[PDB]
Structure formats: structure tokens, C-alpha cells
Amino acid sequence: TRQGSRVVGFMDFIIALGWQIIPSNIRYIYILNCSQFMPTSDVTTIYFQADSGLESIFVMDSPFYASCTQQLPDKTIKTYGVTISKKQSIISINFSSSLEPNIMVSAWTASITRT
Amino acid sequence: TRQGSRVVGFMDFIIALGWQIIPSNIRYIYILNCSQFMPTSDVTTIYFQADSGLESIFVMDSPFYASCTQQLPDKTIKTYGVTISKKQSIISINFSSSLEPNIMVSAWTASITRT
Amino acid sequence: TRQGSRVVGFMDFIIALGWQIIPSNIRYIYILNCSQFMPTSDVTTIYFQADSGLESIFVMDSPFYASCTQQLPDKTIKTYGVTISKKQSIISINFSSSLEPNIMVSAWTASITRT
């Protein structure tokens, strides 16, 4: 099993990611997760340069796909699709619509299995 | 702790399940997870015959309940309830509504505690 | 390191929480999770007194924020924000809207990275 982390300063906020590769007879499992974070603007994309560790989970053609939420002051919940892709050393995290500023986003986990 | 995996071919696509039993003198935790997958038709149910490992987590009368999402072409997010039950050796994964073909479904995890 | 579990009787139902601290030189994590549960009334807040172990994950000013769902009888899915905070030894789990009685709530996990 291989694992690592990456804490990213994006604009004026922090997002904290972890990755794992879990090998077995049947499959390799590629895990990407992210702690809760508070964006400071109407972010649609978070991007950064990855090192070799995090790069190593982007083995499939398909991006990772997860979901997350924010709770509005009126208590309605917004759900966002989260698509995480790599081009060269740049990782991009794309949200299905722009996030609300200054509201916490829930932690999320993506998982890809390669047979 | 005990754990395992099962890859399921269903129709013309794959889903990959992991399971864990985490015993303690406080509780047993039964974990079922699934990697992201891409259904190729508007399925409502994925079923298959369980292996010994996977059958071992179905100790309680209640089915496992989790949720997942798909991001539609217009960027709206559909959330699905996922109910996972066993009758004899047959495991059924029931989605609350039919999945959209050819769109990735997010990974999910379910957890039951027995005290 | 540090981890533990707490089974809480709240009114006439049970919720089962797990906590973990993952020290790190890079991404120091505090995790709170909860197994699926079935509330018996239209609860908005679950609260209880914590012991030192569970208290020990509430180091940040920011509450934990997660999400969970219920599959309603028409097979639509309602998503709830889950905000978990500590005041003195009382832990409060606040749902964004009152839960529907007698319907399973999905398991959830919250993750905070310190720094």
C-alpha cells in the first residue's frame, strides 16, 4: 500500500488532500480524499501542481468523480459534483457549479478500481 | 479486522466492492463500499451471487443504505439512494431511481454498527 | 495516535460514532464518523455528553460539517447538512432540517485537517 498527502494553498484558502493506492490480487484501488474546506470566492476550479506521489493515482483515462455539499444560511443544501483530473503535473478539481463563498464544503472521497 | 473485495460484471460494465468487519468489545462495524462506476444502461438494480467474504457483512436485518450521485450533461446533480440487501446468496443493490447511462456514478460507502 | 467509539442512546434510538486522530508531519487529521441510523421522530439535534476521547477531536473553532441522506417514501432523496460542535462536554449534531421519522439515514464521515 502506498499513500501520501498534499496541503494546497489555492488563492487565500487551504484544501487538504490525501491519496492511497491499495493493491490486491483482484484489483488496484486508487483513493483520493479531501477534508472539509472553506472557499473565499465563487470557485469553480481548484488547480495545483502535483508531485510524483499524487500523480501516481491518475492511471485511468477516467477522472475521479465524487460529490460534496454546502449548507446555505436558509438551511437548503447544495450538492456539487467534483471531477478531479490531471494534465501533465497539473491536477484540476472541477465543481459542477460555483461554490458559495465563506461556507464550509463537506469532506469527500473518490475511489477508482482498476481490474 | 477482516476485509475483502469483489469485482462484479453486470451486464456490460463492472462494479468493484470492498467490505470490512471491524470488531471491538464496544461494537462490530460492517463496512461496504463501492468504487465509482459507469453504468451503460438505465439500471435500477445490480444483483449478483455473493462470495463468502461479502456475505459475512450481512449480519443485521436492516439493509445497508448509502447515497451516490451523477452529474448530468447540464451540470445538474442527481442524488440516488443505494439500498444493499441479501436474500440467500444473492446481493441486490437497489438505486432509488434509474441511473443515467454512460455517466459516472460516484463512489459510496455504507456502515452498520452492531452493539 | 488516537481512536475510539461511542454508542449513543438518544431518545428511543441508537447512533454509533467513531473518532480518529491521524497525526502527521503534513496533514494532521481529525475524523468523526457515524454509522447509518433510524431516528424515530423529527429530530433536528442529537446531543450527549462526551468523554475525553471523543472531546479530543474538537480542537478547531470550526465545527465538523458533513452530509447525509434519507430515501423518502416516493423514492426521492433528501440531503441534510450535518454540523457537529462541542460546548463544554456536550456534543451537538445539528441537521439542516428535521429528519423524517422511521427512515434510515445514511452513514457519514467528517474530516478536518489542522493547519
Residue numbers in the entry:
A (entry chain C), B (entry chain A), C (entry chain B): 420 to 534
The authors write:
Here, we report the expression, purification, crystallization and structure solution of the fibre head domain of BAdV-4 at 1.2 Å (0.12 nm) resolution. It is the second atadenovirus fibre head structure that has been solved, after that of the SnAdV-1 fibre head domain; and the first of an atadenovirus which infects mammalian cells. Crystals appeared after three days and grew to their maximal size in about three weeks. They were found to belong to space group P1, with one protein trimer in the unit cell, leading to a solvent content of 44 % and a Matthews coefficient of 2.2. The final refined model contains residues 420–534 from each of the three protein chains in the trimer, plus ordered solvent atoms. The structure of the BAdV-4 fibre head domain is composed of three monomers, associated into a compact trimer. Each monomer consists of a beta-sandwich of two beta-sheets (ABCJ- and GHID-sheets), in the same topology as other adenovirus fibre heads (the topology of the HAdV-5 fibre head is shown as an example in Fig. 3d). The loop between strands D and G is longer than the others and contains an alpha helix (residues 471–476), instead of the E- and F-strands that many mastadenovirus fibre head domains have in this loop. The CD- and IJ-loops run parallel to each other and contain negatively charged residues, forming electronegative patches on the protein surface. The BAdV-4 fibre head shares only 15 % sequence identity with the other atadenovirus fibre head (from SnAdV-1) for which a structure is known. No salt bridges are formed upon trimeric assembly for the BAdV-4 fibre head, while in the SnAdV-1 fibre head a strong bidentate salt bridge between Arg304 and Glu333 of neighbouring monomers is present, which may explain why the SnAdV-1 fibre head is more stable than the BAdV-4 fibre head.
